[PDB]
Amino acid sequence: IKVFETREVQDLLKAASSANSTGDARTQQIVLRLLGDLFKAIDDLDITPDEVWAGVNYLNKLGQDGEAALLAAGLGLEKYLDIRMDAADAALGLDGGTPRTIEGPLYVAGAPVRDGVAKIDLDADAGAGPLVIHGTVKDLDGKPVAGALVECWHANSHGFYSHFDPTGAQRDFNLRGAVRTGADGTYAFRTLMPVGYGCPPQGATQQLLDRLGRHGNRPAHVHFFVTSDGHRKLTTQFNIEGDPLIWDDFAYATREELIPPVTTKTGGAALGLKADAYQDITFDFVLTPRVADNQIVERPRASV
């Protein structure tokens, strides 16, 4: 049985997506398209009322859990946005900088900004060894970028982020920091080694992933923003070398270029670290110039 092409369905689609205020034309356009696509899929796949109401109930749970942005990551929609942004840059030759990858839903605004270097582990974590991340911010010609704002955030040894830790064990901005580069363009973060993240086991995202036969885990990783006057804003990450989930990220974010080598070094005491032996990661950023920033993204983000 197929009804999508009937006049009644077409009229219903038009009424539901248009004004009886005149409304927002762009919202009307997008709703018409998405509602029409949904109706056609229901027609094509013979999706039953019971199935629709189960999906409607799932949307209630998803929003109740506050997890719609987590599901956006888990279904590859967030990665898809990067694919489209990558293709846009390639058409304009705005590639060759450090590659972007997904932001994820766990950024928090307001971390204290330091000149040159920041120590960002505030809470003791006996399951996480000391880690130093350092490098240079440069332009496409290799010249250092001064005054760039490099922001970092990552998880603790239980896979939890500050401001999102269900045990309440972390202080504000634990494992979150911002460095303002000086004239030499260099940055360094002094922190602890992250462990991979997993979706809240009872949450809506994991519920649907379970139905798909999929896990909800990420490899260990570290997030970055880089903001600089005259350069486009970089959103990226890198993964911790050797993680078994490195090519099995439930958020599809891993890139071969974003897996820097990890090396063990000594002398941690002189760098203010909690142990003599520590892990060291060199990671350089290459920024691209503006045109106006045609790829910066505005989305809801936590703050304190």
Ligand X SMILES: CCCCCCCCCCCCCCCCCCCC(=O)O[C@H](COC(=O)CCCCCCCCCCCCCC)COP(=O)(O)OCCN
Sign of the CA dihedral with 81 first, then 87, 90, and 96 last: positive
In whole angstroms, how close is the CB of 33 to Zn ion at the nearest point?
Answer: 29
Measured from the CB of residue 254, what is the shortest distance to Zn ion in angstroms? 12
Binding residues for Zn(2+), as ranges, are 161, 221, 223
Q: Which stretch binds a second copy (CB under 8 A): 41-49, 127-135, 261-269, 280-288?
A: 41-49
Least separation, in Å, of the C-beta of 66 and ligand X?
A: 11
> Binding string, 96-135, against Cl ion, x = CB under 5 A?
----------------------------------------
110 binds a second copy (CB under 8 A): no
Q: How far is it, in rounded angstroms, from Cα 223 to Cα 193? A: 13
- When the beta carbons of 13 and 120 are compared against Cl ion, the nearer one is 120
Minimum CB distance to Mg ion smaller for 98 or for 205? 98
Is residue 45 involved in binding a second copy (CB under 8 A)? Answer: yes
Query: Which sign does the torsion angle of CA 201, 203, 204, 205 carry?
Result: negative
Instruction: For residue 190, list its beta bridge partners.
Output: 119, 132
Asked whether the beta carbons of 107 and 78 are under 8 A apart, the reply is no
Using CB under 6 A as the binding criterion, the count of chain residues that bind ligand X stands at: 29
- Joined tokens for residue 278: 């520590």
Distance in angstroms (rounded) separating the CA atoms of residues 156 and 273: 16
Distance separating alpha carbons of residues 190 and 132, to the nearest angstrom: 5
Cβ atoms of 2 and 21 closer than 8 Å: no
CB of 295 to Cl ion, least distance (A): 32
Those residues with Cβ within 8 angstroms of residue 221's Cβ, 6 or more apart along the chain or in another chain: 154, 194, 196, 237, 238, 239, 240, 253
Q: Residue 7 interacts with ligand X (CB under 6 A)? A: no
To the nearest 10 degrees (0 to 180), the angle between helices 49-64 and 204-212 is: 140
Specify the pairing of strand 176-180 against strand 302-303: unpaired
The one segment of 59-67, 137-145, 181-189, 195-203 that binds Cl ion by CB under 5 A: 195-203
What, of ligand X, a second copy, Mg ion, none, does residue 248 touch, CB below 5 to 8 Å by kind?
Answer: a second copy
The 2-21 contact track toward a second copy, x by CB under 8 A, reads xx--x-xx--xx-xxxxxxx
Binding residues for ligand X restricted to 51-110, rule: CB under 6 A: 51-59, 62, 68, 71-72, 75, 77
**Pair 164, 304: CB distance under 8 Å:** no
Could you say which of a second copy, Cl ion, Mg ion, none residue 202 binds, taking C-beta under 5 to 8 angstroms by partner kind?
Cl ion
Beta carbon nearer to ligand X, 15 or 41: 41
Closest by CA to 137, choosing from 122, 127, 147, is 147
- Rule CB under 5 A: say whether 104 interacts with Zn ion: yes
Residues of this chain that bind Mg ion (CB under 5 A) = 96
